[PDB]
Amino acid sequence: KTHVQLSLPVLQVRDVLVRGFGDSVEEVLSEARQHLKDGTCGLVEVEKGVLPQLEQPYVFIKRSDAAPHGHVMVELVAELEGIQYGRSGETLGVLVPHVGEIPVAYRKVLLRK
């Protein structure tokens, strides 16, 4: 399928144990995609002071459309030293590995795969 229904666990930034996906735009987008597929991906909601607590490059989920079965359609955009790789809508949050942190909520998304 071109799209996959996912429910992403929303994590508090101070709980996150593994604060990024790797060391290059290409690696983080690769790893984020693999973790999304394996159900091992969390979401951190971006606010003042969140991003400096996480590791660059960042992977964002961004709204790609204006929501089948409650799932907002999103795509991946990566960011390194203020340059973004991809073009999309509003940020729903930053992706990180999920290694057993207790979520505060779930974000239903339809991921363009």
Residues forming a β-bridge with 44: 94
Tokens 């207790």, residue located: 102
Is 42 exposed, middle or buried (CB count within 10 Å of its CB: 0-12, 13-18, 19+)? Answer: buried
Domain definitions of the chain by residue range: 3-112
Reported resolution in A? Answer: 1.7
Helices assigned H by DSSP within 1-62: 25-38
Which amino acid, residue 21? F
In this structure, the dihedral spanned by the alpha carbons of residues 22, 112, 101 and 52, taken in order and rounded to 10 degrees, is 50
Which amino acid, residue 102? I
26, two tokens: 């290409």
Residues forming a β-bridge with 61: 76, 93
> Coil, strand, or helix at residue 52?
helix
Is 60 exposed, middle or buried (CB count within 10 Å of its CB: 0-12, 13-18, 19+)? Answer: buried
CATH number corresponding to 3-112: 2.30.30
Q: For residues 91 and 47, give the distance between their C-alpha atoms in angstroms, rounded to a whole number.
A: 11
